[PDB]
């Protein structure tokens, strides 16, 4: 069910308490999000805790951190917040996030590129859903990432070689290469962006 169970009630109670604690001290919310938590709880916390609109204040600071995991968490948190609170400040922070993604696309190595872009690419669907003005920047960034990853695929011999496929239909759903996996992830997030904007 995922909605009609004791787990949902417990999540609501915990969200109420966390709402109270964040109201009492927003610095606790900032510290918790700098620590991070599993991203499976992100829609839960964003929907169930009204205090999270303050998270847009320290997301630009969290993005600036040198840890890759903190930046990944900032991107995912911003995506969920943008889904919840579609505001001009949210749009500005989303623009900053896309700019940061484009910037460190040319800073991260191949392993770092895989590690950063596998969790944060589905978040780009949320920015497109919330902000149609980001269509140009997000599609341009996706084209850049796809071209970089296609180059990386061409660098070495591959078990799949997605370069020569080139014409696949919607391949709806293993221990594969990171580069072909990232290529497939780019294709899938582009498909999700298109389907949302056409259905």
């Amino acid at each position: 069910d995922n909605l009609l169970c004791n787990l949902r009630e417990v999540q609501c109670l915990i969200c109420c308490l966390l709402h109270q604690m964040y109201i009492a001290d927003p610095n606790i919310a900032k510290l918790v999000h700098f620590q991070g938590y599993p991203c499976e709880l992100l829609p839960l916390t964003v929907a169930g805790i009204p205090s999270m609109h303050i998270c847009l204040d320290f997301i630009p600071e969290l993005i600036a951190q040198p840890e890759l995991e903190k930046q990944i968490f900032a991107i995912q948190l911003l995506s969920h917040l943008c889904i919840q609170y579609a505001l001009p400040k949210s749009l500005s922070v989303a623009r900053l996030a896309v700019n940061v993604m484009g910037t460190l696309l040319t800073v991260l190595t191949q392993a770092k590129r895989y590690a950063f872009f596998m969790p944060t690419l589905p978040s780009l669907v949320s920015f497109c859903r919330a902000f149609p003005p980001l269509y140009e920047d997000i599609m341009s960034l996706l084209i850049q990432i796809g071209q970089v990853c296609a180059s990386d695929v061409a660098t070495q011999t591959r078990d799949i070689d997605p370069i020569i496929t080139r014409l696949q239909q919607i391949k709806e759903k293993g221990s594969m290469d990171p580069d072909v996996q990232l290529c497939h992830c780019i294709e899938r997030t582009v498909i999700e962006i298109i389907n949302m904007s056409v259905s």
Binding site: V107, Q110, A150, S151, D152, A154, T155, D161
Partner: protein, 655 residues
């Protein structure tokens, strides 16, 4: 082995396969010495080598080890004797009553896989009929295997006879006439066509059955003379033979076309010399087509009779005969393709040069082709051919040469010129034409990006009446010409470079890189060898560098900058500074062998705090392979293997 009693060695090995007493390495060494002896001489040992190899293969199979290379090599050419001996060895060496399920499964799998490896099907069946095979395998899996091997090469039976609801239901005369007309349409044999037309004129009166199909088409030059035949049956028969033979020639059904044209020629010889000469022309055209579509495209020369017939048609000047210009075009193309330059440049009558423009063009092409080593007359013929083409590619002074086809100034139309070259397959002639059209395409402006060609020097550098030349038509023509030539020989690296240059001048750089990499791949067997400098010159490499820069693949620019005779650090350093790269960046640093480029990369990444990429570059510098003070052969080899790997990566990326 010392005494040469090799049959005893084979028997000992077969017996040992049951006991496994002998060392495996000893048996392999014996087989190796036997193969060495066979290679030195004594061809009778080939039987012995196969026999002991089969024995060792059976032993390795029973011991659960891989099949040798020599076994597969000997089974490249399976025979009755090889397979029956192998089955005999397997049966002798299995000992089913004593053998474990492990050995039984091993031998079963070995026979199964030998069955899959046989192209021929009789061998598969004869292994399947063997008692050991039947005992070891279940009937289900044996049936499945023979099903697979039978569907590997499935004989298929198909109905070629077209559908026919041909029954007298009712038997009215109209139904009979209609179904006879249907049979006539479907029929292609001239004898049955004659029978059908005889019957049709039988029960009808002046029906003129040549009208029975609108799709039967004859050239208008022949329609008047054919329809003037008096007898209705003869006129209809000649028209149907005309139409059907022409259509068969169109769809490359050349034998049937030959039958129809031979029948028509036999018919018209009785009472018409004009139609006889028309038939002779049609048989000549059909024979040219047969040769160029059959024994052609393989290099074997044509028979002298066809050459003489082509010459006879060319030199005949009968005015009354209606002539199709296409036959003259095909004759000139036939002469040019088969290197009959001497006939064109010496033995052609002058009236043919004056009247038929295709013959004049063929003479010009043959002359400028054969004279290439001798620059004196080659220059003059080149100027003549250049003048002819620029007259063809110019308009009379808005007018566009493509929209206003008639607006040309030359001996014939530009479209006619294109369609004539499309009949030409000879590589040197096409090379000449492409060089001429590339030279023409270059001189439209003072453009820096000028396309090169093999023989660009023999053409003149000046044009009277520049403004008459419609350079849009020239660009269109050279594009069609390059595409056609690559459709002729896709692996001509010169034409691939011309195509790439065209795409580069048009500012579409992905296609330019595609064709430049194709040109490099041709000359080096997909970069397994070094690309020749005459192909990948500094100019071609610079053009690929600009192609990569314009695509924002800046690390590829940095790598390609190392390909030059003098490495261009200016461009490499400028491109590495860019931060909108659309390539893999650090994944490409493995292809950099110059230590200066890597020093710049390290400095650049340190300057930007990109510490991970900085450490990748520092690791790249720290390879002992890349040490700048290594012996020059080691550095050259490092550069060469990185060259090969980078170019193959680019090949995969761009095609």
């Amino acid at each position: 082995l010392r005494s040469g009693n090799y049959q005893e060695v084979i028997q000992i090995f077969i017996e040992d396969n049951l006991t496994l007493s002998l060392p495996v390495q000893f048996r392999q060494s014996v087989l190796r010495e036997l193969f060495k002896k066979a290679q030195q001489g004594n061809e009778a040992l080939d039987e012995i080598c196969f026999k002991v190899c089969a024995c060792n293969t059976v032993r390795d199979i029973l011991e659960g080890r891989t099949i040798s290379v020599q076994f597969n090599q000997l089974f490249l050419r399976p025979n009755k004797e090889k397979i029956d001996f192998l089955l005999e060895v397997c049966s002798r060496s299995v000992n089913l009553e004593k053998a474990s399920e492990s050995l039984k499964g091993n031998m079963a799998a070995f026979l199964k896989n030998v069955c899959l490896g046989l192209e021929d099907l009789q061998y598969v069946f004869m292994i399947s009929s063997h008692e050991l095979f039947i005992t070891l395998l279940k009937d289900e899996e044996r049936k499945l295997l023979v099903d697979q091997m039978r569907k590997r090469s499935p004989r298929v039976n198909l109905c070629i006879k077209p559908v026919t609801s041909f029954y007298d239901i009712p038997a009215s005369a109209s139904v009979n006439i209609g179904q006879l007309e249907h049979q006539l349409i479907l029929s292609v044999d001239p004898w049955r066509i004659r029978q059908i037309l005889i019957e049709l004129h039988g029960m009808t009166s002046e029906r003129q059955f040549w009208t029975v199909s609108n799709k039967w088409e004859v050239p208008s030059v022949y329609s008047g003379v054919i329809l003037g035949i008096k007898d209705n049956l003869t006129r209809d028969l000649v028209y149907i033979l005309m139409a059907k033979g022409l259509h068969c020639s169109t769809v490359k059904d050349f034998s049937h076309a030959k039958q129809l044209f031979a029948a028509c020629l036999e018919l018209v010889t009785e009472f018409s010399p004009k139609l006889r000469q028309v038939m002779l022309n049609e048989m000549l055209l059909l024979d040219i087509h047969t040769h160029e579509a059959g024994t052609g495209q393989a290099g074997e020369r044509p028979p002298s009779d066809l050459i003489s017939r082509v010459r006879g048609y060319l030199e005949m000047r009968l005015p009354d005969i209606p002539l199709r210009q296409v036959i003259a075009e095909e004759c000139v193309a036939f002469m040019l393709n088969w290197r009959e330059n001497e006939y064109l440049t010496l033995q052609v009558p002058a009236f043919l040069l004056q009247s038929n423009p295709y013959v004049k063009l063929g003479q010009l092409l043959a002359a400028t082709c054969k004279e290439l080593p001798g620059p004196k007359e080659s220059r003059r013929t080149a100027k003549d051919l250049w003048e002819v083409v620029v007259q063809i590619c110019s308009v009379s002074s808005r007018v566009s040469l493509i929209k206003q086809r008639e607006s040309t100034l030359g001996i014939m139309y530009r479209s006619e010129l294109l369609s004539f070259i499309k009949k030409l397959r000879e590589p040197l002639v096409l090379t000449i034409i492409l060089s001429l059209f590339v030279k023409l395409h270059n001189v439209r402006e003072d453009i820096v990006n000028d396309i090169t060609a093999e023989h660009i020097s023999i053409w003149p550098s000046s044009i009277p009446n520049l403004q008459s030349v419609d350079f849009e038509a020239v660009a269109i023509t050279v594009k069609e010409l390059v595409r056609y030539t690559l459709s002729i020989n896709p692996n001509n690296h010169s034409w691939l470079i011309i195509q790439a240059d065209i795409y580069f001048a048009t500012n579409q750089y992905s296609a330019a890189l595609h064709y430049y990499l194709q040109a490099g791949a041709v000359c080096s067997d997909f970069f397994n060898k070094a690309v020749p400098p005459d192909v990948y010159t500094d100019q071609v490499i610079k053009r690929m560098i600009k192609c990569c820069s314009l695509l924002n693949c800046h690390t590829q620019v940095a790598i390609l900058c190392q390909f030059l005779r003098e490495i261009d650090y200016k461009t490499a350093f400028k491109s590495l500074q860019e931060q909108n790269s659309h390539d893999a960046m650090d994944s490409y640093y493995d292809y950099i062998w110059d230590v200066t480029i890597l020093e710049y990369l390290t400095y650049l990444h340190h300057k930007r705090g990109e510490t991970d990429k900085r450490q990748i570059a520092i690791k790249a510098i720290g390879q002992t392979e890349l040490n700048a003070s290594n012996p020059e052969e080691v550095l050259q080899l490092a550069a060469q293997r990185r060259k090969k790997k980078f170019l193959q990566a680019m090949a995969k990326l761009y095609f």
